[PDB]
Write a protein that binds this ligand. Structure first.
Ligand code: TSN
Ligand code: K
Ligand code: K
Ligand code: ZN
Length: 347
């Protein structure tokens, strides 16, 4: 019957202010005091080895004992990555903050939780850094829920404006972890420019049907488009999947005002989206911060999400409840690509 909040994240360009402005607005709007302040912890190597290779962990650990030239040389071998001697330490705390909430949520000590962590996670891969992530916070937390808390089925929902290809790759053959991502795509012209971000990538082998990509091919999508996408695609699959834990890649670079997302989703929308997800998995729901590059837009998105976690009434949506035709095409094609796998889509 509480909502947990973890904040250790600053001591690490598109900014430590990302996370300190969130806390400030959480405090100002009275939401911080209404949360159960949960302490972060450092991830162990064994928890990291759930998802990442041994050679990658060793390489990432040696990142602190490197010179400024050693860091820049390594960083260029990755796509969109900046290294600094404190990255590894902060990334270990970033993972561990999610693991702290998963513990509290699975043991019924709290109803739900939100980690306000940096660095983000959803681009990080088995053996490489990518898009500012070193370790995949949510991928680790999902396998940790299975191993330590005996979860059979984890649902990961990724509403950051970018595709979390790292989460997709890690669980691509895995029917026990269902990954849903809605993201700006524009037929590959938007980063990370991947064919496998399209709705045709539905998983492979026994994982088929358990990877769901919803790619936006126009800019300026709004709350009605996300609500329609949740109500007609994600939630029917979720109730059929019957997860025992929901993890959210909670980026807010789709919020109105984000300098690089190019979407017009009102922050209030994330109250609704969060509320919908509470109906699944007996409300066992953990959000973890990903992207967000307008300090104020990001802080409002967090606050709207936190209000639903706390059980406050849903807000008024300023935007139309109607989805645009471009969104309906994207939604239609993903449903079609996943039709043979989910009875609930076959209306
Ligand atoms: C990775 C990312 C967002 C991730 C996110 O938010 N995932 O959720 C944005 C990239 C495209 C970007 O904008 C960028 C800017 C500068 C740069 N260098 C100066 C090297 C490299 C990349
Ligand atoms: K996404
Ligand atoms: K999967
Ligand atoms: Zn993003």
């Amino acid at each position: 019957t509480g909502t947990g909040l973890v904040y250790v994240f600053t001591r690490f360009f598109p900014c430590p202010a990302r996370v300190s402005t969130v806390m400030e607005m959480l405090e100002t709007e009275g939401l911080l005091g209404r949360c159960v302040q949960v302490e972060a912890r450092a991830v162990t190597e064994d928890e990291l080895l759930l998802v990442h290779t041994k050679e990658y962990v060793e390489l990432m650990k040696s990142t602190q004992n490197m010179t400024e030239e050693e860091l820049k040389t390594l960083a260029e071998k990755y796509d969109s990555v900046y290294l600094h001697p404190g990255f590894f330490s902060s990334a270990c705390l970033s993972v561990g903050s999610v693991l702290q909430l998963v513990d509290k949520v699975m043991t019924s000590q709290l109803r739900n939780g939100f980690s306000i962590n940096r660095p983000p996670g959803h681009h990080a891969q088995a053996d490489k850094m990518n898009g500012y992530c070193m370790f995949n916070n949510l991928a680790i937390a999902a396998r940790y829920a299975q191993k330590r808390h005996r979860v059979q089925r984890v649902l990961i929902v990724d509403w950051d404006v970018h595709h979390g290809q790292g989460i997709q790759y890690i669980f691509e053959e895995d029917p026990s972890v269902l990954y849903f991502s809605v993201h700006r795509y524009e037929d590959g012209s938007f980063w990370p420019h991947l064919k496998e971000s399209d709705s045709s990538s539905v998983g492979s082998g026994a994982g088929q049907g358990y990877n769901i990509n919803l790619p936006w091919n126009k800019v300026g999508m709004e709350s009605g488009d996300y609500i329609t996408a949740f109500q007609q695609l994600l939630l029917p699959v979720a109730y059929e999947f019957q997860p025992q834990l929901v993890l959210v890649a909670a980026g807010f670079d789709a919020v109105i005002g984000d300098p690089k997302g190019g979407m017009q989703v009102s922050p209030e929308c994330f109250s609704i989206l969060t509320h919908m997800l509470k109906g699944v998995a007996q409300g066992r729901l953990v959000l973890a911060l990903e992207g967000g590059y307008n300090l104020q837009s990001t802080a409002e998105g967090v606050c709207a999400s936190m209000r639903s976690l706390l059980g406050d009434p849903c807000p008024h949506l300023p935007s139309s409840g109607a989805p645009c035709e471009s969104a309906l095409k994207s939604i239609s094609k993903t449903i079609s690509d996943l039709y043979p796998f989910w009875k609930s889509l076959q209306t």
